[PDB]
């Protein structure tokens, strides 16, 4: 019981320090800011090739090719500009929760309930998509396997453990077992040296790829965290949870700095993303419509109300030219302003 | 425009392949098999394959030339409040419970309650398989274990007229069977609003007619779905 008492004392010290830092609120340093105003993003192009509920997508580095994963068991790579379907990869397991596009655009990763992340090569000399690699070893369902480079993939699984994998040898290069619940999604910082993840315990943790140890922990949420994304600079990240409230966390501050919630909003958040400045926190909701908020003033900026079912996956191009939303109605929609 | 024309041609081929996949996808039905450790869902899976940390196992079977995909959760943690949401468009959920064990029966009842009350499972009928009936009958005949202690409401229970006892079945065994079935049906009907129904069946681990019952339940579910879709219900 001594260890429990020591842990309680350390938690009290953590709380006291974090309080000692907190003098002012983001809302105050930002009260002197002009509101963004109503955002009137409209649907420019619509993709209807998918069969079942889409569950994951990832914009490419070129902001022209996108990858979408659908539970029919299909990974479709679309050309956003011309609506043409660049590729269609059938998947061995119909249940897919995550998909990622390599920075160079040569490899595409996917994963789901199979507890495996499968990587396919698009630049084969034959011109046909094939299973380049299969990574196994996780004892839980893969919720997000993202790319760092062509030969190294970081993944989050439902065994409360995250992994870094070398793809040539196919073994677990690094392992992270600090969480106590299902890790739901992770985001890589642009520096490609730290990454932040969230678990089904109202807890987010920061991890170092090279070292392999937990850096910081944040427990500001009430319910399970489903979405996480890194603010452009890499020093902050937004989190969405089933409690219907989003939050903003900063690594250096080590505590929450914003909360986005409303009385009318009762549904949780499935996917979150930031814009190229960080002034537009877009977030999916189970109410079948996405909402974009002013990240600095916590003022609702716009609502994308075109969707028939729960929005699952949200993506923003590298240049922030368009926002792509994929819901359970087997339709991806590209939204842009005027 | 040669590159553009090639791009549109490739898109057309991909569209044709996706249309083939569409026809295949609508030609098969998806079912989710769930149960506890005590429940003999593995035995059912073995006896229905007569037509590594994998995580999920898939059974392909066929009844009346209708293809059925069953998915069984494998190397996954006890937590189930999140991945279950992937099974929101399955045709049906086959829930297997061990009626012989009076202890842990309340756990199965609570699991059924959670499944029924789940937001994303409100539009999916649940097929109920009360398994291990022979063990329940033997336990009732022995009399060593009494349902009254676990379920004090069982004392006042009486077999309803709707009950159809099997030939050569002791009144006590059928009374207990239908008491447990009514316990399940109370939860089934408490939240049912016309978009959710249960199919109570008395089944055994060694049974060759479970597939027929599953096919009939799927037929009824799709019949109701068509009734609603074709402006009749």
């Amino acid at each position, epitope marked *: 019981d001594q260890l429990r008492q020591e842990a309680e004392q350390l938690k009290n010290q953590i709380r006291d320090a974090r309080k000692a830092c907190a003098d002012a609120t983001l809302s105050q340093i930002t009260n002197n800011i002009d509101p963004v105003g109503r955002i009137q993003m409209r649907t420019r192009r619509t993709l209807r090739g998918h069969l079942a509920k889409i569950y994951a997508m990832h914009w490419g580095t070129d902001s022209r090719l996108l990858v979408s994963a659908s539970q029919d068991g299909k990974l479709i790579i679309w050309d956003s500009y011309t609506t043409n379907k660049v590729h269609a990869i059938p998947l061995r397991s119909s249940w897919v929760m995550t998909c990622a596009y390599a920075p160079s655009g040569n490899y595409v990763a996917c994963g789901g309930l199979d507890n495996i992340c499968s990587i396919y090569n698009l630049k084969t000399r034959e011109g046909n998509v094939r299973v380049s690699r299969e990574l196994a070893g996780h004892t839980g369902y893969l919720s997000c396997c993202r790319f760092l480079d062509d030969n190294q993939i970081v993944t989050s699984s439902g065994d409360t453990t995250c992994a870094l994998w070398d793809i040539e040898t196919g073994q677990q290069t690094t392992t992270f077992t600090g969480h*106590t619940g299902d890790v739901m999604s992770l985001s890589l910082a642009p520096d490609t040296r730290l990454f932040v993840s969230g678990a089904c315990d109202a807890s987010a943790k920061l991890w170092d790829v090279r070292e392999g140890m937990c850096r910081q922990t944040f427990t500001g949420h009430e319910s399970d965290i489903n979405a996480i994304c890194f603010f452009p600079n890499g020093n902050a990240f937004a989190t969405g949870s089933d409690d219907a409230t989003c939050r903003l966390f900063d690594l250096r501050a080590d505590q929450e700095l914003m909360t986005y919630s409303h009385d009318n909003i009762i549904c949780g958040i499935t996917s979150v993303s930031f814009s190229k400045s960080g002034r537009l926190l877009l977030a999916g909701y189970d109410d079948f419509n996405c909402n974009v908020w002013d990240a600095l003033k916590a003022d609702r900026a716009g609502v994308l109300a075109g969707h028939d079912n729960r929005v699952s996956c949200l993506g923003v191009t590298d240049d922030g030219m368009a926002v792509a939303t994929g819901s359970w109605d087997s339709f991806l929609k590209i939204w842009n302003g005027s | 425009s040669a590159e553009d024309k090639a791009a549109v041609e490739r898109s057309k081929m991909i569209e044709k392949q996706l249309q083939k996949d569409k026809q295949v996808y609508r030609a098969t039905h998806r079912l989710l098999l769930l149960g506890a450790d005590n429940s003999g869902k593995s035995t059912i899976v073995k006896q229905m394959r007569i037509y590594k940390t994998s995580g999920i196992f898939e059974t392909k079977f066929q009844v009346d030339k209708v293809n059925f995909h069953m998915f069984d959760v494998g190397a996954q943690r006890d937590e189930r409040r999140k991945w279950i949401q992937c099974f929101n468009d399955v045709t049906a959920i086959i829930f297997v419970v061990d009626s012989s064990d009076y202890n842990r029966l309340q756990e199965a009842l609570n699991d059924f309650k959670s499944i029924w009350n789940n937001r994303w499972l409100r539009t999916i009928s649940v097929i109920l398989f009360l398994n291990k009936q022979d063990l329940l009958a033997e336990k009732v005949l022995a009399g060593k274990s009494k349902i009254e202690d676990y379920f004090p409401e069982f004392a006042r229970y009486t077999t309803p007229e709707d009950a159809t006892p099997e030939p050569g079945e002791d009144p006590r065994v059928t009374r207990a069977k239908y008491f447990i079935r009514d316990e399940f049906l109370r939860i089934s009907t408490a939240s049912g609003d016309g978009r959710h129904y249960c199919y109570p069946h008395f089944t055994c681990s060694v049974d060759t007619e479970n597939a027929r019952r599953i096919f009939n339940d799927c037929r009824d579910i799709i019949q109701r779905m068509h009734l609603r879709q074709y402006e009749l219900l």
Partner: nanobody, 126 residues
């Protein structure tokens, strides 16, 4: 942040009467349907009873029916469970648990081996 602390317990002779309290901090007590669990020596976690947000809907396991009762105090952020006619076979570590999500009628993993929204628990002995 989230913290559930249980209070009460101690040795009691068979047939006594006790009251166990459950204080919650971090979330909103009202929006969450809460339960009671118990782990008994040589046995696993068992679902005792539940109470909803409004408190007008209750359910008990028959083994503790007619004997124990559940109440909620949203203003005090506190759950209460009365123990009456206590039997020796009701000796266990009692845990306070809440349903994963708010405004939700389903609670799946309340009885799992590990649950990130359950308190330390208190040892009630008889």
């Amino acid at each position: 942040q989230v913290q559930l602390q249980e209070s009460g317990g101690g040795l009691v002779q068979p047939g006594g009467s006790l009251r166990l309290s459950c204080a919650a901090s971090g979330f909103t007590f009202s929006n969450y349907k809460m339960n009671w669990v118990r782990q008994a020596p040589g046995k696993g976690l068992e679902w005792v009873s539940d109470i909803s947000q409004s408190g007008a809907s209750i359910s008990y396991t028959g083994s503790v029916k007619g004997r124990f009762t559940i109440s909620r105090d949203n203003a005090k952020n506190t759950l209460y469970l009365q123990m009456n006619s206590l039997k020796p076979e009701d000796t266990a570590v009692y845990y306070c648990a809440r349903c994963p999500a708010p405004f939700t009628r389903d609670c799946f993993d309340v009885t799992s081996t590990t649950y990130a929204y359950r308190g330390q628990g208190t040892q009630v002995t008889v």
